[PDB]
Design an enzyme around this catalytic site. Structure first.
Site, mmCIF file in Angstrom:
data_model
loop_
_atom_site.group_PDB
_atom_site.id
_atom_site.type_symbol
_atom_site.label_atom_id
_atom_site.label_comp_id
_atom_site.label_asym_id
_atom_site.label_seq_id
_atom_site.Cartn_x
_atom_site.Cartn_y
_atom_site.Cartn_z
ATOM 1 N N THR A 139 -3.542 0.907 4.130
ATOM 2 C CA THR A 139 -3.427 1.938 3.057
ATOM 3 C C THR A 139 -4.728 2.722 2.933
ATOM 4 O O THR A 139 -5.804 2.134 2.835
ATOM 5 C CB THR A 139 -3.094 1.301 1.690
ATOM 6 O OG1 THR A 139 -1.821 0.641 1.762
ATOM 7 C CG2 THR A 139 -3.062 2.362 0.578
ATOM 8 N N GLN A 140 -4.619 4.048 2.949
ATOM 9 C CA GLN A 140 -5.764 4.923 2.715
ATOM 10 C C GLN A 140 -5.335 6.100 1.842
ATOM 11 O O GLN A 140 -4.266 6.080 1.225
ATOM 12 C CB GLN A 140 -6.365 5.453 4.032
ATOM 13 C CG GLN A 140 -5.987 4.713 5.306
ATOM 14 C CD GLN A 140 -4.669 5.203 5.878
ATOM 15 O OE1 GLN A 140 -3.695 5.377 5.145
ATOM 16 N NE2 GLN A 140 -4.635 5.441 7.188
ATOM 17 N N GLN A 152 -1.838 4.692 -3.976
ATOM 18 C CA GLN A 152 -1.323 3.532 -3.187
ATOM 19 C C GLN A 152 -0.189 3.974 -2.262
ATOM 20 O O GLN A 152 0.668 4.767 -2.654
ATOM 21 C CB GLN A 152 -0.844 2.416 -4.125
ATOM 22 C CG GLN A 152 -0.343 1.158 -3.425
ATOM 23 C CD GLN A 152 -1.434 0.440 -2.649
ATOM 24 O OE1 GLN A 152 -2.506 0.157 -3.186
ATOM 25 N NE2 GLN A 152 -1.167 0.137 -1.379
ATOM 26 N N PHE A 153 -0.189 3.448 -1.040
ATOM 27 C CA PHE A 153 0.812 3.811 -0.041
ATOM 28 C C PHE A 153 2.134 3.083 -0.289
ATOM 29 O O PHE A 153 2.180 1.852 -0.340
ATOM 30 C CB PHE A 153 0.305 3.509 1.372
ATOM 31 C CG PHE A 153 1.346 3.696 2.440
ATOM 32 C CD1 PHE A 153 1.924 4.939 2.653
ATOM 33 C CD2 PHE A 153 1.751 2.628 3.229
ATOM 34 C CE1 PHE A 153 2.886 5.114 3.633
ATOM 35 C CE2 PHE A 153 2.709 2.796 4.212
ATOM 36 C CZ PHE A 153 3.278 4.040 4.414
ATOM 37 N N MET A 170 1.507 -1.247 7.167
ATOM 38 C CA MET A 170 0.886 -0.753 5.929
ATOM 39 C C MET A 170 -0.438 -0.023 6.186
ATOM 40 O O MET A 170 -1.367 -0.092 5.381
ATOM 41 C CB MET A 170 0.698 -1.895 4.919
ATOM 42 C CG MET A 170 2.004 -2.502 4.431
ATOM 43 S SD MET A 170 2.998 -1.337 3.479
ATOM 44 C CE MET A 170 2.079 -1.291 1.940
#
Ligand SMILES: [Mg+2]
Lengths: 222, 231, 235, 250, 212, 244, 240, 233
Positions: free
Chosen positions: H1-2, A1-2, H107
């Protein structure tokens, strides 16, 4: 997760004198156990005799300072080159911070300068924009190491007059700019010894009626 | 005649009358002069009052530390266009850490004005602008028309009776271009230029407006007793 | 027909020029700026004696340090006043200070040219905006539907404006007291009004640094009218 | 760009007339004659295939169109306007009915939907009315056989028999004399061919006449077997040969 | 943080502590927990510092616009409802607020509204909010009367914050006192808890458990 | 641009009249006459179809009288297509109200809603108004039997007896002459048909040129019944009242 | 969307669409408002060109906006419904947010604001309506009477009339209404209102409507017979 | 997000007296699979700037196209596009830094760590870092990923502070960079022997070196190492 947030370390310190104000910060920038830079300026002259630092996540910190500097520019355009007073700058920064209440700038902001009576002023902000005028404020990594020392040596807390045994407090006499700088240097030297994220260099910006002056001092590089 | 009802209609000779009428508003406006050397660029503007109780309408607007303009015509339109320039100058600095070139600023003003000449519902801008600036290629002076035509010049003038100042600058061309490293003499040449457009009235302390930008000189406007030195 | 934003062959906007004609039909409003304060006065002009004249509100507070008088289609002024009040309060919220009188005036004038085919026409009302700030002291501005605003030492708008302005040309000097300005507004209003001036068909107001913007009681104005009558009979 | 015509192009004149609708009806009047006749056991709709050129293949131009398996349509007036109305009528039969109730709409309600579309072109912004009058013939379980006329205004009326376009006035008089409530489908077809001959100048044969019926269910045209309740379409377009056979008994 | 407000014969007493904490770390001992909405209205800070500061200053702006438009002082009822309706729009987003909106008007008399970030709006005579609210309630409930004098009411509010400051780890620093009258609020000073505790202990005979 | 072709459908005349409303009313004056008469024990709706043909399928035809719900019906005068647009909207409003309150919509509330829709087309949008005038016949338990009319302006009024369409001036005079307050439905049926018979532009009034309806508490006990008359039933009532 | 500027200035500085909206008001039936010492009375003309009318169900000329405020009008009837609906919604919105019913001045200011908005918005025409708004502020016994018009201007009146022949009834009111001593009772106020309409109305039968509003949400409409008694007493004093 | 898929490892760089040096290997990893062996991760912009990129390669190729588009756009209506109004290293960096912070704020980050190396119009050395979080910083030596842990310590022994920069020649600087690349090849499991090196000098301009190899490697000592403790044979 970022994870959109990070921690760049660093420690800052603002102190308001009788007719001056100082905003100091170390020049070390870090992630985890690595040093990114031994000299990355963190305290900035924003014009109108106002100095600012947004400590914590450096990306957010740089963004906020950039937007505030921009706000000063447009305040001049919109209001006939009127000088942005330190109290007005403080209220403006609240709105900049609270504008991202639900995705905050991960920083602890401090500004310093002079109020409209020429007296020294420091303002302190939390990440979402709550603020107060203060006499003394450390921020960042080693803030917990520095503040108690400042309570004792600036405000003379727990200090009483010899012979009276607790009956008469040590009187709160005003400190000169030379005296304040000594306390700032000792605060950072002590923080450097006991905090791994503090070191390399100390840059102090001093604000008086004459303008903004800079002083630099080496700190331990380990 | 039958072809001046809106900006979206060519006349049989290929003219755009609404644009020409917008050009006419500039001719009614008060005179303003622009000129430059290789080190500095100067604006001089004759401000106009409503009556003796009123203030003199400001003519010069700062756009950035290195750029600004003077206006002649509809003042609110100058506020719109100068605001746009302020934003573009600001976008260049924030995104590219780059001061906006004066030539590129002219191109942006041309394109913004053009859109208002080809579409229904809108109107052309009713103001002329003289943009001065100092960038990486030295001093610059531009002349903006609300037709969209922007032109780079050594000197010029727009507004009522501007032809007198323009002829003077055309004579003085070889002299004032050489005024390098001497701001006061370049302003003197500009004050002498705008004087060729005066009738009945003369340059007083609340009448005259001067701006300058140069090599080590941020764009600064001089009004009031600050221009008494040049009267 | 023709566009609402159309230029005339002389380089003027038809609709702006026509709105100026509507303002000429409005009741007279006068402002005088002094170093002791700015005075604002209006002709109420009730259309009938059964109309309760104290309900005629042509002088209005924008903030404590800024007042405003109107002339023309006065219904159009309500959204302008709302914007002005909002702008004044919003700036105080953002900057913890009073807004400059010029900055407030500029904000109001930004609405003016927001018309086309935004609102469908220009405003049919002119405003006299009077106030005080620390930087430029006591100020009086004339805000038009063109988007242009001029600062004035003294200014009259409405039906009796050119006669009143000529009178203000002769009477104004840089040493006027607040009391002298009050009587001067009353004198010139009395000159240009159709009906005989009294405390019920005319209204006074002022803005001072100490007390801020205040609309004068009818009892207070009545005394100033009596003072005016006696000093004109004094020579 | 953007459609800036958001205002009505059809408006009331001082006399109370809606000009654009009247003018649309005038365009219909110039159009080629088409007719419809209702029998006890069916309905017939017919028109002339006015070929614009002999090099043109007039079989590729369908004036009589299937809307649903049990409903057909013909027109008089502007052909292109008709073609798009047929496309919309076919789609609206599905979207506003079949996808809801799982069956095809009754004739009167499909007519109502087509009428609504034509009414909206008479009031909506930046459009002209449709320059056609439609004749819609159909069958459904509870209403039986029916025939409707739809005009540019959106108004619709049910008919026993009628005609629209060029020679409608003469054709309607011809139909009034021949129609009764005891006609069989073959009798109605015979009367249709007789009526249509009067308004046709040139060639009168299966290749120049377009004719369709709403009659018995055609299981041979269903395309599949195995479901007893599905018995095939009632709409059937007569062939060129089928028309010529009935022109010998004319 | 401990904050209280109670109605009485002479108007309203508002009393608050001054401590702000981040975990165990004492961030500040000099926090201003009474927000001066305008010269007639007061609000108290509890929960989110920014949320309280921001929206109660904003409230002051809305109150100023009201009286400009209506040429009349805004009611405490109307003022409190502007704030509660606002935070109700944000319900779920994570605002944190527990405040007392306090005022004294002609039509209402002294009035207190508890406003809260999940949308609650309660009128009442005595309210207490914060980590040390339970301690302050004890002193309030056992000593409160409607016919308290302004002097005694001020002390009661001061003493109740002191009680909380002593026992509650997250309350302390100093005590701020306010007295709300019909003609506006009156500030009654900042009182360091360190000095106040010993002063009260001696004069009152309380806190015998603590050695002084 | 486009302004050139704009008729401006929503503007006052110098006299303070709405051009398009006035012209729409002119259109409606050429429509077939519709009459509504309210009695103590019910309401009558009578209306004349416009110059018909012998080949028109009358028993499946509807151009004048429409059902809005089980308690409310309307008589139409004007553009039939325009009317159907509004009728479908009114039918939806009635069902919306029934779903919301679990009670049948009071007559006036339905009438006000449709009238407000008409009003909107006269004040904003730049579209032509609906060229339709309605007569509303309905019942609810508050006011009992009610008659209303609405026209393209969006203005509506209540009536004991009323006409719309062609020859309303002549029709209204005839109704005003013979109407009484203690009148009954059977008497009102006769009055309506007699009035149409005298005002009609046709040579004679026959069953094929008429649409007829009654709203009666002549429904077994404490309820209301709508009756849209069939062609044969209109033929019978014409003989009963002695017109044919 | 339709954006056409219908209300625009003319060379002489007039907005004709607003002025033509006033001509629609001139055509409307006469309305009158008179405030006494402890009441306000709204009188309205009913044109007798329409008989066979059902008076039970026909829209009444005076409308309650709230329990304490009423609104009458002259002009386009359909237009007035839109203003009345908006006002009624705003009245409930004010109670919901301010926890206090609207003042008569506030409600007037809102309605007037709507009317003004329709004079400088694209694609709309002005309201062909002038209104008389009357009532009592909450917990206040001072009578209130305001007037609005298509342009959006509004003002307070001791007594006022609008609509057709309003010039005549205003003439009557201007000589018969004394400010130093307004109609001290309900009787006197109603009498003066009926008298003012009798200058213009025709027959004093079903042509005059009277609504009396008193403090504390006390609003009642007079019946035909009650009004008829005023009509009778007025002319019997006149025969002298 | 990746998540990053095809990735590039360390980018390393340092200032010297007359300019800057930057280097990066030619590998595009696919997890532990050393998938692509000819990937150029140093991308020159004009003749005064080289942008070194680590992390996600698909995002690198996107950034490469943004920079290519930037050059095209700068040339539009710009007579001095190859002179006074040419792209500066500081312009290129500020643009990228803006993009990186904007993308993290939505994000949806560009999963990279970037070092912009160049020489300004006035001859000043430019060296600054930016990553997926929009975090920026400058230093006499800069490195990404493993380079930060292993290269920086070695490069900081040459230039430890600002005053060491004028004392450092291009030969000494390049030598240090080349040694650091060898150390990274010994110790980073996602590195390759093949790399590119770029020098941007205020006098000699941009020198771009391709197909360089790690050489002079020590492996001989491996022959004496036996077992993991007690084993002798
Ligand atoms: Mg350390």
């Amino acid at each position: 997760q970022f994870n959109p947030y990070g921690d760049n370390g660093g420690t800052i310190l603002g102190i308001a004198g009788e007719d001056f104000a100082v905003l100091a910060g170390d020049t070390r920038n870090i992630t985890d156990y690595s040093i990114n830079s031994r000299y990355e300026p963190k305290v900035f002259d924003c014009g109108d005799n106002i100095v600012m630092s947004a400590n914590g996540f450096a990306a957010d910190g740089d963004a906020l300072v950039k937007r505030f500097k921009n706000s000063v520019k447009w305040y001049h355009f919109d209001h006939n080159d009127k000088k942005l007073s330190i109290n007005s700058a403080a209220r403006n920064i609240q709105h900049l911070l609270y504008g991202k209440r639900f995705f905050p700038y991960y920083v602890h902001t401090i500004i310093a300068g002079l109020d409209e009576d020429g007296k020294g002023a420091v303002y302190s902000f939390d990440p979402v924009g709550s603020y107060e005028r203060e006499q003394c404020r450390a921020g960042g990594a080693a803030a917990s190491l520095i503040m108690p020392f400042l309570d004792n040596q600036v405000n003379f807390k727990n200090q009483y007059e010899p012979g009276t045994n607790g009956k008469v407090k040590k009187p709160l006499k005003y400190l000169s700019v030379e005296e304040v700088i000594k306390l700032v240097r000792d605060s950072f030297t002590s923080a450097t010894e006991r905090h791994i994220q503090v070191g390399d260099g100390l840059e102090i910006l001093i604000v008086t009626k004459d303008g903004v002056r800079k002083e630099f001092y080496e700190l331990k590089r380990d | 005649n039958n072809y001046d009802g809106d900006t979206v209609t060519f006349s049989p000779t290929g003219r755009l009358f609404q644009v020409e009428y917008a050009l006419e508003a500039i001719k009614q406006g008060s005179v303003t002069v622009g000129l430059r050397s290789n080190t500095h660029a100067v604006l001089v503007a004759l401000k106009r009052n409503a009556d003796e109780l009123s203030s003199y309408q400001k003519k010069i607007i700062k756009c950035d530390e290195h750029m600004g303009l003077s206006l002649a015509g509809l003042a609110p339109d100058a506020r719109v266009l100068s605001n746009y320039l302020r934003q573009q100058c600001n976008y260049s600095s924030l995104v590219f850490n780059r001061k906006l070139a004066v030539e590129r600023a002219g191109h942006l003003l041309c394109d913004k004005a053009q859109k208002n000449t080809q579409s229904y519902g809108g109107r052309p801008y009713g103001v002329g602008l003289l943009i001065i600036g100092y960038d990486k290629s030295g001093a610059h002076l531009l002349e903006f028309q609300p037709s969209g035509n922007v032109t780079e010049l050594y000197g010029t003038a727009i507004g009522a009776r501007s032809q007198g100042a323009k002829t003077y600058l055309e004579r003085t061309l070889d002299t004032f271009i050489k005024i390098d490293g001497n701001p006061d003499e370049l302003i003197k040449a500009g004050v002498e230029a705008i004087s060729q457009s005066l009738r009945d009235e003369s340059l007083t302390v609340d009448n005259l407006s001067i701006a300058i930008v140069g090599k080590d000189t941020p764009f600064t406007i001089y009004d009031g007793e600050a221009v008494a030195k040049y009267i | 027909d023709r566009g609402v934003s159309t230029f005339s062959p002389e380089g003027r906007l038809f609709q702006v020029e026509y709105s100026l004609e509507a303002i000429k039909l409005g009741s007279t409003a006068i402002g005088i700026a002094t170093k002791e304060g700015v005075v604002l006065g209006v002709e109420k002009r009730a259309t009938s004696p059964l109309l309760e004249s104290d309900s005629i509100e042509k002088i209005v507070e924008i903030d404590r340090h800024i007042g405003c008088a109107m002339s023309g289609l006065t219904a159009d002024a309500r959204s302008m006043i709302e914007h002005a009040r909002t702008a004044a309060v919003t700036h105080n919220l953002y900057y913890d200070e009073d807004i400059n009188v010029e900055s407030l005036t500029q904000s109001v004038c930004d609405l003016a040219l927001r018309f086309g085919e935004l609102m469908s026409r220009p405003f049919g009302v002119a405003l006299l905006i009077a106030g005080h700030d620390a930087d430029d002291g006591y100020q009086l501005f004339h805000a038009e539907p063109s988007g242009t605003f001029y600062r004035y030492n003294a200014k009259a708008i409405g039906s009796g404006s050119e006669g009143a302005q000529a009178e203000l040309l002769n009477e104004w000097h840089s040493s006027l007291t607040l009391k002298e300005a009050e009587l001067l507004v009353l004198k010139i209003l009395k000159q240009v009004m159709e009906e005989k001036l009294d405390e019920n068909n005319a209204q006074l107001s002022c803005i001072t640094k100490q007390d801020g913007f205040k609309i004068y009681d009818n009892e207070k104005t009545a005394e100033l009218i009596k003072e005016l009558k006696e000093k004109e009979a004094a020579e | 760009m953007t459609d800036r015509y958001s205002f009505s192009l059809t408006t009331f004149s001082p006399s109370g007339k809606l000009g654009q609708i009247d003018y649309a009806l005038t365009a219909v009047k110039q159009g080629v004659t088409s007719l419809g006749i209702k029998a006890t056991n069916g309905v017939v709709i017919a028109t002339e295939k006015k070929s614009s050129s002999p090099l043109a293949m007039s079989e590729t131009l369908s004036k009589v169109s299937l809307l649903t398996p049990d409903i057909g349509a013909v027109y008089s007036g502007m052909g292109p306007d008709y073609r798009v109305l047929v496309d919309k009528s076919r789609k609206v039969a599905h979207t506003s009915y079949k996808r809801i109730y799982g069956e095809y709409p009754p004739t009167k309600l499909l007519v109502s939907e087509v009428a609504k579309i034509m009414q909206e072109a008479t009031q909506s912004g930046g459009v002209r009315p449709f320059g056609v009058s439609l004749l819609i013939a159909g069958h459904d379980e509870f209403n039986g056989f029916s025939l409707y006329q739809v005009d540019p205004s959106g108004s619709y009326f049910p008919w026993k028999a009628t005609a629209i376009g060029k020679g409608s006035v003469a054709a309607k008089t011809f139909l009034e004399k021949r129609w009764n409530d005891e006609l069989e489908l073959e009798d109605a077809i015979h009367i249709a061919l007789l009526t249509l001959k009067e308004s046709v100048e040139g060639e009168f044969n299966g290749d120049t006449i377009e004719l369709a019926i709403i009659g018995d269910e055609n299981p041979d045209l269903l395309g599949y077997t195995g479901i007893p309740t599905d018995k095939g379409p009632r709409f059937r377009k007569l062939t060129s040969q089928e028309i010529n056979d009935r022109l010998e008994a004319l | 943080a401990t904050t209280l407000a109670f109605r009485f014969q002479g108007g309203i007493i508002v009393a608050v502590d001054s401590r702000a904490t981040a975990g165990n770390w004492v961030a500040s001992q000099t926090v201003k927990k009474v927000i001066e909405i305008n010269p007639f209205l007061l609000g108290t800070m509890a929960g989110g510092a920014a949320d309280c500061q921001f929206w109660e200053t904003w409230l002051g702006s809305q109150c100023r616009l009201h009286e400009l438009r209506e040429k009349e002082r805004i009611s405490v009822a109307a003022a409190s409802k502007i704030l509660s309706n606002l935070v109700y729009q944000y319900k779920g987003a994570g605002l944190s607020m527990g405040t007392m909106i306090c005022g004294y008007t002609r039509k209402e008399g002294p009035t207190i509204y508890y406003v809260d970030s999940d949308g609650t709006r309660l009128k009442g005579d005595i309210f207490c909010v914060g980590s040390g609210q339970t301690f302050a309630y004890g002193v309030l409930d056992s000593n409160y009367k409607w016919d308290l004098s302004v002097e005694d009411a001020l002390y009661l509010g001061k003493r109740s914050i002191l009680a909380a400051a002593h026992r509650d780890a997250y309350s302390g620093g100093s005590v701020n006192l306010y007295h709300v009258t019909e003609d506006g609020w009156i500030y009654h000073g900042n009182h360091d808890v360190g000095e106040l505790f010993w002063k009260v202990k001696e004069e009152e005979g309380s806190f015998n458990n603590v050695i002084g | 641009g486009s302004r050139r072709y704009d008729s401006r459908t929503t503007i006052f005349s110098p006299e303070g009249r709405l051009y398009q409303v006035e012209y729409a009313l002119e259109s409606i004056s050429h429509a077939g006459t519709a009459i509504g008469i309210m009695a103590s024990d019910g309401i009558v709706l009578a209306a004349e179809r416009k110059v018909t043909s012998t080949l028109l399928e009358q028993d499946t035809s509807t151009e004048k009288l429409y059902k809005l719900n089980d308690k409310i019906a309307v008589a139409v005068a004007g553009l039939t297509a325009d009317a159907e647009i509004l009728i479908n909207t009114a039918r939806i409003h009635a069902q919306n109200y029934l779903k919301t309150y679990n009670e049948d919509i009071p007559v006036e509330i339905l009438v006000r809603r449709l009238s407000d829709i008409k009003q909107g087309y006269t004040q904003h949008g730049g579209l032509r108004p609906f060229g339709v005038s309605f007569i509303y016949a309905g019942y609810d338990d508050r006011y009992g039997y009610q008659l209303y009319t609405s026209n393209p302006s969006g203005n509506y009024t209540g009536w004991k007896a009323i006409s719309v369409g062609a020859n309303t001036s002549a029709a209204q005079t005839l109704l005003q002459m013979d109407y009484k307050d203690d009148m009954k439905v059977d008497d009102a049926i006769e009055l309506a048909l007699k009035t149409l018979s005298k005002t009609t532009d046709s040579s004679a009034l026959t069953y094929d040129r008429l649409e007829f309806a009654t709203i009666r508490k002549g429904a077994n006990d404490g309820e209301v019944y709508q009756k849209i008359f069939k062609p044969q039933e209109i033929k019978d009532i014409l003989v009963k009242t002695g017109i044919t | 969307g339709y954006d056409r500027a219908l209300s625009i200035f003319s060379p002489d500085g007039h907005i004709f669409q607003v002025e033509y909206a006033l001509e629609a008001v001139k055509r409307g039936t006469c309305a009158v408002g008179v405030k006494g010492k402890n009441c306000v009375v709204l009188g309205c003309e009913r044109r007798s060109t329409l008989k066979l009318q059902d008076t039970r169900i026909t829209p009444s000329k005076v409308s309650k906006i709230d329990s304490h405020v009423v609104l009458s009008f002259s002009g386009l009837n359909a237009d007035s419904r839109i203003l009345i609906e908006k006002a009624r919604v705003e009245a409930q919105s004010h109670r919901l947010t301010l926890e206090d019913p609207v003042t008569v001045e506030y409600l007037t200011r809102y309605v007037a604001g709507v009317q003004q908005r329709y004079t400088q918005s694209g694609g709309v025409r002005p309201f062909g309506v002038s209104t008389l708004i009357a009532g009592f502020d909450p917990r206040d016994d001072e009578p209130k009477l305001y007037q609005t018009e298509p342009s959006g201007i509004y003002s307070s009146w001791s007594a006022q009339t609008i609509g057709r022949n309003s010039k005549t009834v205003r003439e009557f009111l201007e000589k018969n209404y004394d400010r130093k001593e307004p109609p001290a009772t309900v009787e006197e106020c109603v009498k003066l209102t009926v008298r003012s309409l009798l200058e213009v109305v025709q027959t004093g039968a079903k042509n005059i409507e009277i609504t009396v509003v008193k403090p504390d949400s006390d609003i009642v409409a007079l019946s035909s017979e009650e009004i008829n008694q005023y009509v009778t007493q007025i002319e019997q004093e006149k025969q002298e | 997000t990746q998540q990053p898929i095809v990735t590039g490892t360390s980018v390393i760089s340092m200032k010297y007296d007359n300019g800057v040096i930057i280097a990066a290997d030619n590998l595009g990893s696919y997890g532990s699979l050393l998938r692509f062996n000819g990937v150029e991760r140093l991308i020159p912009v004009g003749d005064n700037t080289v942008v070194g990129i680590s992390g996600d390669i698909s995002d690198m190729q996107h950034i490469e196209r943004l920079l290519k588009d930037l050059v095209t756009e700068n040339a539009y209506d710009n007579p001095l596009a190859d002179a006074e109004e040419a792209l500066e290293p500081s312009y290129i960096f500020e643009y990228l830094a803006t993009v990186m912070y904007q993308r993290r704020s939505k994000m949806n980050p560009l999963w990279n760590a970037i070092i912009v190396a160049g020489v300004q119009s006035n001859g000043d050395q430019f060296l600054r870092y930016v990553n997926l979080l929009g975090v920026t910083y400058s230093s006499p030596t800069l490195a990404t990923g493993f380079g930060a842990h292993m290269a920086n310590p070695l490069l900081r022994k040459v230039v430890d502070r600002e005053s060491d920069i004028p004392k450092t020649t291009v030969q000494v600087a390049e030598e240090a960079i080349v040694n650091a690349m060898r150390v990274l090849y010994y110790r980073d499991a996602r590195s390759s022997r093949n790399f590119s090196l770029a020098i941007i000098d205020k006098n000699t301009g941009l020198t771009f070196k391709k197909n360089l190899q790690v050489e002079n490697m020590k492996w001989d000592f491996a022959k004496d190492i036996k077992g993991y403790g007690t084993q002798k044979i």
